[PDB]
Each structure stands twice: as C-alpha cells, then as structure tokens.
C-alpha cells in the first residue's frame with residue numbers, strides 16, 4: 001500500500017527530487033486506516049518527518065532508507081504502535097537517539113545503519129521483546145554497549161560496527177540465545193572477548209575487528225560450532241591460537257591478521273574441512289605449517305605472510321584443485337615449491353618472496369593457465385628457469401630477481417601475450433639476453449640487472465611498451481644498438497657498469513619522453529651528440545667513467561650535475577674548450 | 578557513513 005497505490009482526484013506522483021512533508025504530509029492527511037505499508041525509499045528526499053504521520057495508525061512496514069532525511073529522530077513514529085519493521089538506514093539523522101522506541105512493542109526489524117547519530121546507544125531498545133534484527137552501525141555513537149541489550153531474547157542479528165564505541169565488551173551479551181550474526185568491529189572496544197560469548201550456540205558470523213581488543217584468545221570459543229565467519233583482525237591479541245579452535249567444524253573464513261599472536265598454527269586446523277579462507281598476516285607466529293593444511297578440501301585463500309614460519313611447505317598443497325591465491329612472503333620457509341599448487345587452473349596470485357626456498361622452479365608452474373601475478377624474489381631457487389611461461393594467457397607480473405638461476409633465459413618470455421613486469425635481476429645466468437626480448441607486445445618494466453649477462457644487446461626491434469629498462473652491472477660488450485628510437489615510451493634506461501664500446505646512439509635524441517639515462521662505467525667514445533641539448537625532457541644523463549671526447553652540449557644540458565662527467569673537456573660549463 | 582566488512586583486503 002505504498003507509492004500512492006490506494007488513493008486512501010489527488011496525487012500518484014511521489015517522485016521529483018523534491019522534499020517530503022509538504023509533498024508528503026498530504027499523504028498523511030489522507031487520514032485512512034487503509035495504509036499498512038509505506039515505502040518511501042530512494043526518492044532523493046530531504047528533511048524531517050511531519051508530526052501528522054501519527055495518523056497512519058495501521059502501519060506495519062515503514063521504509064525511508066536511502067534518502068537525505070535530516071534532523072533528530074522524529075518521535076512521532078513511536079506513535080505507530082502497530083509498526084513491525086522500520087528501515088531508517090542511509091540518511092542524515094543526527095543528535096542523541098530520543099527515548100520512546102518501547103511503545104513499538106511489536107517491532108521486529110529496526111535498521112538505522114549509516115546515519116549521523118551521536119551520544120549513547122538508546123538503553124530504551126532493550127525493552128523490545130519481539131525484536132530480531134538491530135542495525136545501529138555506521139554513525140557516531142559513543143560510550144559502552146548497554147549490558148541490557150543482552151536481554152534481547154529472540155534477537156538473531158546485531159550490527160553496531162563503525163561508530164566510536166568503547167570500553168569493555170559486556171559479558172551479558174553472551175545470553176542472546178538466538179543470535180546468529182554479530183558485527184561490532186571498527187570501534188574502540190578494549191579488554192578481551194568475554195568467555196560468556198561461548199554460549200551463543202547459534203552464532204554463524206562473528207566480526208569485532210579493527211577495534212582495540214587485547215589478551216589471549218579465549219579458549220572457550222571452541223564451543224561455537226555452527227560458526228562460519230570469524231574475523232578478529234587489526235587488534236592487539238597476544239598469546240597463542242587456542243587448540244580448542246579445531247572444534248569450529250563449520251568455520252569457512254578465519255582472519256587473525258594484524259595482531260601479536262605467538263606460537264604455531266594448531267595442527268587441529270587440519271580438521272576444519274570447511275575452511276575457505278585462512279589469513280594470519282602480520283603476527284609473531286612461528287614453527288611449521290601443519291601438513292594437513294595442504295589437504296583441506298575447500299581451501300581457496302591462504303595468507304601467512306609477515307610471520308616467522310620455519311620448515312617446508314605442505315607437499316600436497318593445491319591438490320584439492322581449488323587454490324586461488326597464496327601468499328607466504330616474508331617468512332623462513334625452505335624446501336621446494338610444491339608441484340600441485342595450480343592443480344585445477346584456479347591459482348592466479350602466487351606470492352613467495354623473502355623466504356629460503358630451494359630447488360628448481362617446478363615445471364608444473366609453467367602450465368598454470370590462470371596464473372597472473374608471480375612474486376618469488378629473494379630466495380635460493382637454482383637451475384634453469386623453465387620454458388613455458390610465455391604460453392600463459394594472463395601472466396602479467398613476474399618477479400624472479402635475487403635468486404640463483406643459471407644457464408639461459410627462457411625465450412618464450414619475449415612472446416608472453418600480456419606480461420607487463422619482468423625483473424630477473426641478480427641471478428648468475430652467464431648467457432645472452434634472448435634475441436627477441438624487445439619484440440614483446442606488452443612489457444613496460446624489464447630489469448635483468450646484475451644477472452651476469454654477456455654478449456651484445458639485441459637490436460631494439462619493435463620495443464612497443466617498454467618504459468623502464470635495467471641492464472646495469474653485467475658484462476654486455478659490443479655497441480649500444482643505434483635503433484633505440486623504436487622505444488618511444490622509454491623513460492629510464494640504465495646500461496651502466498658493462499663493457500660497452502662505441503658511440504652514444506644519436507637516435508637517443510628521438511626522445512619523446514626519455515628522462516633518466518645511465519651509461520656510466522663503460523668504454524664509450526665519441527661526442528655527446530649536441531642535439532641532446534634540445535631534449536626538453538632529460539633530467540639525468542650519467543655518462544661518467546667513459547672515454548668520451550669533445551664539448552658537452554648546452555641548452556637543456558647546461559644545468560645538469562657536473563658529476564655526470566669524468567672523461568674529457570666540455571662546453572664552457574666545465575674546463576673551457 | 579560507510580563501514581567496511583569482509584576479510585582483510587591487504588595484499589602483495
């Protein structure tokens with residue numbers, strides 16, 4: 001009976017980003033005991049509720065959410081004694097919440113999420129004995145949680161996240177016999193989680209994260225079966241994870257990231273066969289990862305980074321055919337990389353950097369069809385980077401730097417279809433760059449520096465998307481290829497600390513955007529082509545420790561660092577000609 | 578005002 005359904009001649013036009021009361025208020029003076037539902041949601045309306053709404057005495061449903069209503073809460077609505085659900089969320093109501101919701105004795109749903117309320121949560125609501133959902137999140141509520149909200153038997157959903165509440169969590173809330181969902185994080189609560197919460201036997205969803213909580217995690221919450229979602233990240237919990245938590249047989253998502261937890265992942269975690277998401281980022285955890293975590297039938301997300309785990313990664317990880325992202329960077333893992341990680345071709349993000357992994361990159365990883373981001377630098381991986389990565393259709397970011405890769409560089413990298421970043425620096429190759437490395441379609445950043453490269457630099461054929469090229473600190477001999485003006489997107493080039501002879505490629509001056517150039521510590525000879533002084537874009541041109549001769553250019557070279565030279569003579573701006 | 582929900586979005 002909303003949007004002027006029954007007239008209850010007169011208006012049917014409830015639209016037009018106009019304001020209520022007076023566009024409204026006629027709706028009410030159609031006095032009528034015929035109106036049981038009124039839905040004024042998402043009409044772009046702005047203001048106050050008129051006193052006269054008290055005359056819609058038969059209302060059961062009232063939803064005014066998603067407008068711009070303002071002012072303090074209108075206590076006239078408390079005269080709608082038959083109201084059963086009231087949705088006020090996503091408005092601009094402010095001030096302390098006024099008393100009197102008690103008279104809505106049959107109220108079953110109250111949603112006020114996202115408002116401007118301040119002051120204390122209304123202790124008055126503890127008297128709505130039929131209520132089932134309460135949502136006061138998203139405002140500026142202050143103070144403690146009223147311990148009397150624990151008398152809200154019948155209540156199954158409570159949301160108070162995103163205010164500025166604090167104090168200790170009221171132990172009495174643990175008597176909400178029928179509570180299925182509790183979301184109360186993003187506040188300033190202190191102290192620990194009351195162990196009485198272990199009586200919320202129906203609880204499926206438990207947040208309270210990004211608060212100020214502390215203590216050991218209460219062992220008693222192993223009692224919460226039925227629970228599927230447990231978020232307690234961004235707090236101050238210390239101590240170890242209770243081994244009692246292996247009894248949360250329904251748990252699908254676990255997130256303890258950003259606390260101070262110590263000790264090991266409890267090996268009972270290997271029994272949580274419904275786990276989808278295991279996240280323990282940024283803690284003080286240690287020891288080994290229980291092998292059975294590699295056997296979890298539904299695990300999709302495995303975040304263990306920024307701890308100090310020892311030992312090997314579980315051999316069978318990925319064999320469930322479901323892994324999507326794994327990140328264990330910044331630990332002390334050892335051993336080889338399991339072959340099964342991408343079984344199922346669902347793995348798209350594989351992050352392993354800053355460990356001590358050993359052995360050859362498993363060749364199964366070259367047939368991981370879904371792989372997209374691969375970061376494995378700062379390890380001890382040896383052998384030949386296998387061939388096959390350039391045949392993955394979505395691999396765009398690869399970092400294998402600071403490892404121990406030897407022999408050659410896979411030639412299929414140059415034919416990877418969407419690869420955008422490839423590093424490979426620091427590695428001990430002792431062979432040439434792949435002949436068609438510059439061919440590559442998309443590839444903006446390539447950085448094989450200090451990787452014991454040898455031989456000449458291939459001709460810059462194509463060079464479509466490169467904007468940063470790092471090859472410094474190898475033994476590249478020969479001449480810098482003279483067709484470098486094909487690299488029209490180039491911004492930074494470093495070929496310093498090599499064995500390059502010959503002249504500076506004048507085609508460097510076909511420079512739409514070149515900014516940083518470092519050719520120092522080589523054996524170059526010849527002038528700096530005076531045309532370089534016309535570049536309105538070069539800010540660094542380090543060419544020191546070479547065998548160059550002649551004047552330095554002027555123009556946009558006249559205000560460069562003299563240190564950038566150390567060879568012989570140069571335009572008045574140093575040692576006159 | 579809006580309030581974040583879900584797991585921790587932090588990533589590498």
Ligand SMILES: *[C@@H]1O[C@H](CO)[C@@H](O)[C@H](O)[C@H]1NC(C)=O
Nearest residue numbers: 041042063065085086087109
């Ligand atoms: C209020 O309206 C929105 C859509 O405009 C709807 O999603 C929401 O569930 C409504 N509230 C209630 C309590 O039904």
Ligand SMILES: *[C@@H]1O[C@H](CO)[C@@H](O)[C@H](O)[C@H]1NC(C)=O
Nearest residue numbers: 283284285306307308330331
């Ligand atoms: C992880 O590395 C960061 C720097 O990347 C460091 O601040 C932190 O202490 C490290 N933590 C562990 C547990 O490895």
Ligand SMILES: *[C@@H]1O[C@H](CO)[C@@H](O)[C@H](O)[C@H]1NC(C)=O
Nearest residue numbers: 286287307308309310331332
């Ligand atoms: C991590 O544990 C081992 C010692 O067993 C070692 O790699 C290192 O000393 C530890 N790191 C830190 C930051 O305590």
Ligand SMILES: *[C@@H]1O[C@H](CO)[C@@H](O)[C@H](O)[C@H]1NC(C)=O
Nearest residue numbers: 377401402423425426445447
């Ligand atoms: C490539 O890797 C090296 C060492 O691993 C690192 O220091 C460098 O900054 C990286 N280069 C780019 C362009 O990211």
Ligand SMILES: *[C@@H]1O[C@H](CO)[C@@H](O)[C@H](O)[C@H]1NC(C)=O
Nearest residue numbers: 454455456475476477478499
């Ligand atoms: C340097 O280049 C020349 C080109 O003829 C090659 O013969 C020589 O072996 C190169 N130096 C190496 C590969 O160490």
